[PDB]
Design a protein around this ligand. Structure first.
Ligand SMILES: O=C(O)[C@@H](CO)OP(=O)(O)O
Ligand SMILES: [Mg+2]
Ligand SMILES: [Mg+2]
Ligand SMILES: [Mg+2]
Ligand SMILES: [Mg+2]
Lengths: 432, 433
């Protein structure tokens, strides 16, 4: 059973409080922490913050922590359920909170326990984490995913004018996971120089996810820099490009604002048809193979029309928020062909696994994802392997809240030894 | 005894390779990894790199990793020594290397085993890491250090003109380590707002250690920005300022170039006297209580004279490189009154505890330090408690290779319960508490 749970406030990678949980069994101690987004969709389960403006500027998580220490912990303990029963323990937590969006305890409260139970569960089974997860998910071929490295940053929170949030590289042609990391790192460090040469040393500092934020406006120019770094590294044949537009962040009165970090002005705003045609030029002119949140989380028509007019991967994030009910609708409407999977959008492991199986059941790709506020926790590296999804984005190869995950994928690859496989060019559908 | 040792290459926080080590005993797996400097002292132990231009720009550590797997690991397994015997295991390795600066295997090879052995030993003793360290050190006060947070990055850690490396805030007034975390973070976030309003959002990206990299040249202006944020956060009484100049990075033919990241022009260079005088202004205009590497690593005359002429903490880093020989010379010349402690400048736990005790017996402070290239490893967190040094610099409260250490110190404080004490205004000299 569970002997003890102890939750506390720690600092995530931007220096804001988040929830960490210690859960103890007769096997020992298991610790997990909860990440936090900046471009959070309106449909995500509630991140409970304290809002005491005199303390971490309103961002403390004492209330979430106390819900764990005062309510969740006593309950789960006295239940006497084994930590192998992921689903029953998660449902219990879900009934206890009693709300649909987990607004009673916070999803950051429930998830911190849910992850730590999962780690306890692995060890109760004497499996490493990635194999326990695969058992919870009915999987067997524990493929290593292609990493997607966020190398240039724009968007809502970025010190520059660049509207589109993330421009990523995917080493689809590397020989193994370890190899992909090496390609990603070389391109990254090459990019830095390409930026320094073109823009000045000032332009080479990092944003939240470890990528660079040059002082540029044109999304075509970012892609241009990324493709140059890929050539100059010499991997044109091995590395492709993915984008996270995060379009909800610049949605304005039913049109779209590509300049939005400027102080307001509706004359620039373009329509979804105009924004769709830009992407089609991007897909024609650059090796872009994936685009995430190309439209607002509510602009369903633009998603379906786009998806039915392209061959590339189209990824729902803010559209789907790892939520089964929202995914069925995207399925019905053929909104996209890939789920971005964020445990903290829905708020328990069990519901994330279910979101995963539903996407995969209906022929979708699935990409596991960090939040832009991460911790040293590495759960998601085990999650992507265990879920056989074949793709993960968890940062630039820079800042150790991103590398903690990359390094742990290398450890998994090495742990699988001779039986380890890399998704490479089958990242969208590694089930082949 | 040790059952097996597996080393691998992982990536550090700048996305370069570094050593990590998995050590197996009866108790299980003990893992540690090796950090890596950018402004590395000329006298530092050798960090062994591959030098293969077709692989991570020559920055691979395949060689150091193979030294561990193929030579050091059977060496330590054959000895049959318990992991608790830090000193014996460290000497074993130092003798097998047999060079002064560890250039046969690399400081990076030796250290990663040394750290792992260390964590395995704490498990064997049934002790948390910081207590085991305290026992190797012969301490039983486990005081929590004042954290020194590098909130504006310059020099070799940031893409800007700003020449001095590090502008640090020290919550000397804090009630506890956990409360020092809150003050640090609130000032950091306040400073993001100050820098944003004054220089634009483009000035709020960060350099290697998590501090803002604003587009500035004047070191006075960085100090100014920090003061302003302290004040706006409401903490002028409770928080003071520290600097790492690292003048070695900008020492140019007997002079100093405060614009070294600009196209070379030797007229802009100033003498060490001018540099010193500049330090005297900072000390009077700002609550600067500590300055690290204010002169070049070989510029001993400028060091002794500046130190005899101030009552603040003066920190040796590239001057001392965590090395007992260089420390003795610094004590004799009165170069400085604080040691910067960096396991990887010297290359083993045992050596680093020895360099520490040395400083403390000569009445020096000791500030434990991360490197600019870090990992998810939280060793130095337990190390600073176990060594009772009362001060640690391990980043801005931003980037988890920093926050993994700060979060660990909060966990250690919480674990000490009511026995927990906070160094505070005693960060130079915590033994009196
Ligand atoms: O103080 C220093 O000099 C260190 C650590 O902050 O930087 P580097 O690791 O680059 O030497
Ligand atoms: Mg988002
Ligand atoms: Mg997104
Ligand atoms: Mg240095
Ligand atoms: Mg230094």
């Amino acid at each position: 059973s569970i002997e003890k749970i102890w939750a506390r406030e720690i600092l995530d990678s931007r220096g804001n409080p988040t929830v960490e949980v210690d859960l103890y069994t007769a096997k020992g101690l298991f610790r997990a922490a909860v990440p936090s987004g900046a471009s959070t969709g309106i449909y995500e389960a509630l991140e409970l913050r304290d809002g005491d403006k005199q303390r971490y500027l309103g961002k403390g998580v004492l209330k979430a922590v106390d819900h764990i220490n005062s309510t969740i912990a006593p309950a789960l303990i006295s239940s006497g359920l084994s930590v192998v029963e992921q689903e029953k323990l998660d449902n219990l937590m879900l009934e206890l909170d009693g709300t649909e969006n987990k607004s009673k305890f916070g999803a950051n409260a429930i998830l911190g326990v849910s992850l730590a139970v999962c780690k306890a569960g692995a060890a109760e089974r004497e499996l490493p984490l990635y194999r326990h997860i695969a058992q919870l998910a009915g999987n067997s071929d524990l493929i290593l995913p292609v990493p997607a490295f966020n190398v240039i940053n724009g968007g809502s929170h970025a010190g520059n004018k660049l509207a589109m949030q993330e421009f990523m590289i995917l080493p689809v042609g590397a020989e193994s996971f370890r190899d992909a990391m090496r390609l990603g790192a070389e391109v990254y460090h090459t990019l830095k120089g390409v930026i320094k040469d073109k823009y000045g040393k000032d332009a080479t500092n990092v944003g939240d996810e470890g990528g660079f934020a040059p002082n540029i406006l044109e999304n075509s120019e970012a892609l241009e820099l990324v493709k140059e770094a890929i050539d100059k590294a010499g991997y044109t044949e091995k590395i492709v490009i993915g984008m996270d537009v995060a379009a909800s962040e610049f949605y304005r009165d039913g049109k779209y604002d590509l300049d939005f970090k400027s102080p307001t002005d509706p004359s620039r705003y373009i329509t979804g048809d105009q924004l769709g045609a830009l992407y089609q030029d991007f897909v024609r002119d650059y090796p872009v193979v994936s685009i995430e949140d190309p439209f607002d989380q509510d602009d369903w028509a633009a998603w379906s029309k786009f998806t039915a007019n392209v061959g590339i991967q189209i990824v729902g994030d803010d559209l789907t928020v790892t939520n089964p009910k929202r995914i069925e609708r995207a399925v019905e409407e053929k909104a996209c062909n890939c789920l971005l999977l964020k445990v903290n959008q829905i708020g328990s492991v069990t519901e994330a696994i279910q979101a995963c199986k539903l996407a995969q059941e209906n022929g979708w790709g699935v990409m596991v994802s960090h939040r832009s506020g991460e911790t040293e926790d590495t759960f998601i590296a085990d999650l992507v392997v265990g879920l056989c999804t074949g793709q993960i984005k968890t940062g630039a190869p820079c800042r150790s809240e991103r590398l903690a995950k990359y390094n742990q994928l290398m450890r998994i690859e090495e742990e699988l030894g001779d039986e380890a496989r890399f998704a490479g060019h089958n990242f969208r559908n590694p089930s082949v």
